[PDB]
Ligand binder design. Structure first.
Ligand SMILES: Cc1cc2nc3c(=O)[nH]c(=O)nc-3n(C[C@H](O)[C@H](O)[C@H](O)COP(=O)(O)OP(=O)(O)OC[C@H]3O[C@@H](n4cnc5c(N)ncnc54)[C@H](O)[C@@H]3O)c2cc1C
Ligand SMILES: NC(=O)c1ccc[n+]([C@@H]2O[C@H](COP(=O)([O-])OP(=O)(O)OC[C@H]3O[C@@H](n4cnc5c(N)ncnc54)[C@H](O)[C@@H]3O)[C@@H](O)[C@H]2O)c1
Length: 515
C-alpha cells in the first residue's frame, strides 16, 4: 500500500515525490522505465540538445540553496548539464531510494470499493495506492516516418529520441529527415563534422538566433544577487521566460523603429522574445504576424547567399506561430558539403540498402540516416497505459475524441487522478508550470488527509467549462488558423489565479466523497 504512486521520474515526477514524501510525510513510490532520473533529459541525448529557456530559469525555484549553488556556464543549458542538475536534485534530497527504475507501468485500474488504484508494472507486479500522480511529460512515442524500404537500410539508423552512444560523424555521408527544433539542433551540430549532409525538409519553418553565449562570473553574480527577484516576475508573467512581455502594437509605429525592435530581439535571441518581447499583437493581429515573418524572411535572404536555397528555406504559410531557436542554422546551408532537398515537392518514395530515393529518382547515398521526425501528442503518453477508472472505462475511450481535463490536471470518470504537465495546460515555461501544479495537487491531497476524504473526482461539467475557457482564449489568436492537442493560453499568472479560484472556493467542480 502507498498514499501515492508516481509515474515518471523527470521534472514533474521528481518534485511530486519530494512534495508528497518530505513536505507531507506520505508513503510514496515513483516508477520510471528509465534507469536514472531526468525524463526526456535522460532519453534525448542527440547532438545539440538544448533548452528553449535560459539556464537561470530552467530549474527549480523552491530550493534556494540550489539556486545559489547552481552552475550557470552558458545562457542556455545543454542536455548533459540538465541531467547533472536533476541528478544533483536527486542526490541532495535522497529521492532515488523511493524510485524503482527499469520498471514500466502496464495498467492502472481504479478500485471503486476501497477507493484506490491498481497499478500493475510490466514485471507482472502490482501495487495499491489511494492517489496516482501521473508525470509523463509532453513527449510521447517517437513518430517515425512511414517510408518504403526502411528495413533495408544497411547503414546507421537513429531516431533522435533513441540516440545511441559513441556515434562518430567524420568522413560519413549523413542524412537528416525533419526540420523542427530537434532537426535544427542536430543539423547545426553535425554539418561541420560530416563529409556531406543532406537535409530532407518537408516543411520549412521560421527560426531565430538563440544567442547561447558563455556566462561570466559577473553575469552569474548579477543573477544570483537578484534571484528572489527573477522568480517573482515569473509568477507575474504569462510565459515565465523572464521576458519583458510587451503590449505595444506592431503597426502603431514607423517602419524604421519596427525594424529596430525586431533587430534588438534578433541580437539578444530567443523564439519567445522575438514574438512577445518585441510587440504584443504578433499572435493575434494578421498584419502584425506578417511583419514579423518578413523580418525573418529578409534575414534568411541576407544569410543564405544562394537565392534558390534561400527560397527553399523560406516558409510558405500565411500565418506563423512560435518560431524555432538555432545556433547558426541558416548559416549551415552556405557550405560546400550541405544539400537542401525540398521533400514536399520531391518526396521520398523508397530508401534502398545504401541510399534514399526521392520522387525524381535520384538516389541519395547515405552512410547514416538520422530521424528527427518528432513524436505524438501528450494523450499518447496516457493512451499507451491501460488506465481504467469508473465503469472500467479506459483512458483511450474517454479521450477518443481528443483530450480534455479540469485545470489541466484531473479527468472526469478517473477519480484520485492528478496530472502533472497534462493536456489543456498553460503555454509557458515548463518548470514554473510543473511547480505550480505539484503545489496545487499536493495541497489538495493535504486537504484530503485532514478532512478525512478518500475519493476526489472532477465533474464532467467542470472539464467542459475548462475546455470552453480554453477555446475562448484560443480563438482570440491566430493559433487556430496556423500550425497549432489543446492548450490554455491565458498565461501563467492567469492560470495561477484560475486554479486558486478553485482551491479557495472549496474546490468547486470537484466531487468530494467521505468515508
Ligand atoms: C531537448 C529538449 C529541450 C526542451 N526544452 C524545454 C524548454 O526550454 N522549456 C520548456 O518549457 N520545455 C522544454 N522541453 C519539454 C520537456 O518535456 C519539459 O522539460 C518537460 O516538463 C519534462 O518534464 P516531465 O518530467 O514532466 O516530462 P518527462 O521528462 O518526459 O517525464 C516523463 C517520464 O515518465 C516516464 N514514463 C512515461 N510513461 C511511463 C510508464 N508507462 N511506465 C514507466 N515510466 C513511464 C518516462 O520514462 C519519462 O522518463 C524540452 C524537451 C526537450 C526534449
Ligand atoms: N527546447 C527546445 O529547444 C526543444 C528541443 C527539442 C524539442 N522541443 C519540443 O519537442 C517537440 C519535438 O519537436 P521536434 O523538433 O522533434 O520536431 P516537431 O515535433 O516540431 O516536428 C517534427 C519535424 O519533422 C518533420 N517531419 C515529420 N514527418 C516527416 C516526414 N514523413 N517526412 C519528412 N519530414 C517530416 C516535420 O517537418 C517537423 O518539422 C517540439 O514540439 C518542441 O517544442 C523543444
Amino acid at each position: 500500500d502507498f498514499d501515492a504512486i508516481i509515474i515518471g521520474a523527470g521534472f514533474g515526477g521528481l518534485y511530486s515525490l519530494k512534495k508528497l514524501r518530505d513536505d507531507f510525510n506520505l508513503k510514496v513510490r515513483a516508477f520510471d522505465r528509465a534507469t536514472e532520473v531526468g525524463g526526456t533529459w535522460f532519453w534525448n541525448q542527440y547532438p545539440g540538445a538544448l533548452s528553449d529557456s535560459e539556464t537561470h530559469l530552467y530549474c527549480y525555484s523552491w530550493d534556494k540553496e540550489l539556486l545559489q549553488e547552481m552552475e550557470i556556464k552558458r545562457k542556455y543549458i545543454s542536455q548533459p548539464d540538465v541531467l547533472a542538475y536533476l541528478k544533483r536534485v536527486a542526490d541532495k534530497h535522497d529521492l532515488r531510494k523511493d524510485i524503482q527504475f527499469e520498471t514500466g507501468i502496464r495498467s492502472a485500474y481504479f478500485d471503486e470499493e476501497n477507493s484506490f488504484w491498481n497499478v500493475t508494472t510490466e514485471n507482472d507486479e502490482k501495487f495499491t495506492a489511494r492517489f496516482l500522480i501521473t508525470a509523463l511529460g509532453p513527449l510521447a512515442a517517437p513518430n517515425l516516418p512511414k517510408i518504403k524500404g526502411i528495413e533495408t537500410f544497411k547503414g546507421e539508423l537513429h531516431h533522435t529520441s533513441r540516440w545511441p552512444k559513441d556515434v562518430t560523424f567524420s568522413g560519413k555521408r549523413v542524412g537528416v529527415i525533419g526540420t523542427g527544433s530537434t532537426g535544427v539542433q542536430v543539423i547545426t551540430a553535425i554539418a561541420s563534422q560530416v563529409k556531406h549532409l543532406t537535409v530532407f525538409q518537408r516543411s520549412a519553418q521560421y527560426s531565430v538566433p538563440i544567442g547561447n553565449v558563455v556566462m561570466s562570473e559577473t553575469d552569474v553574480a548579477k543573477i544570483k544577487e537578484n534571484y528572489d527577484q527573477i522568480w517573482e516576475n515569473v509568477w507575474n508573467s504569462a510565459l515565465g521566460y523572464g521576458l519583458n512581455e510587451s503590449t505595444l502594437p506592431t503597426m502603431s509605429v514607423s517602419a524604421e523603429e519596427r525594424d529596430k525592435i525586431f533587430e534588438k530581439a534578433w541580437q539578444e535571441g530567443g523564439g519567445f522574445r522575438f514574438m512577445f518581447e518585441t510587440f504584443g499583437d504578433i499572435a493575434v493581429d494578421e498584419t502584425a504576424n506578417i511583419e514579423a515573418q518578413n523580418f525573418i524572411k529578409k534575414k534568411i535572404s541576407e544569410i543564405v547567399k544562394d537565392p534558390f536555397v534561400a527560397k527553399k528555406l523560406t516558409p510558405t504559410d500565411l500565418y506563423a506561430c512560435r518560431p524555432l531557436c538555432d545556433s547558426g542554422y541558416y548559416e549551415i546551408f552556405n557550405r560546400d558539403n550541405v544539400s537542401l532537398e525540398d521533400v514536399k515537392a520531391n518526396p521520398i518514395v523508397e530508401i534502398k540498402e545504401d541510399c534514399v530515393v526521392t520522387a525524381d529518382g535520384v538516389e541519395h547515398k547515405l552512410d547514416m540516416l538520422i530521424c528527427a521526425t518528432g513524436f505524438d501528442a501528450v494523450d499518447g503518453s496516457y493512451k499507451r497505459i491501460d488506465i481504467r477508472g469508473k465503469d472500467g472505462i479506459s483512458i483511450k475511450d474517454h479521450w477518443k475524441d481528443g483530450p480534455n481535463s479540469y485545470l489541466g490536471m484531473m479527468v472526469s470518470n478517473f477519480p484520485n487522478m492528478f496530472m502533472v504537465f497534462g493536456p489543456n495546460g498553460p503555454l509557458a515555461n515548463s518548470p514554473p508550470i510543473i511547480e505550480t501544479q505539484v503545489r496545487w495537487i499536493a495541497d489538495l491531497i493535504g486537504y484530503a488527509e485532514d478532512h478525512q476524504i478518500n475519493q476526489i473526482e472532477a465533474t464532467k461539467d467542470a472539464v467542459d467549462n475548462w475546455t470552453n475557457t480554453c477555446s475562448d482564449i484560443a480563438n482570440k489568436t491566430l493559433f487556430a488558423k496556423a500550425k497549432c492537442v489543446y492548450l490554455y493560453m491565458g498565461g501563467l499568472k492567469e492560470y495561477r489565479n484560475q486554479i486558486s479560484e478553485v482551491s479557495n472556493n472549496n474546490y468547486k467542480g470537484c466531487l468530494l466523497k467521505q468515508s
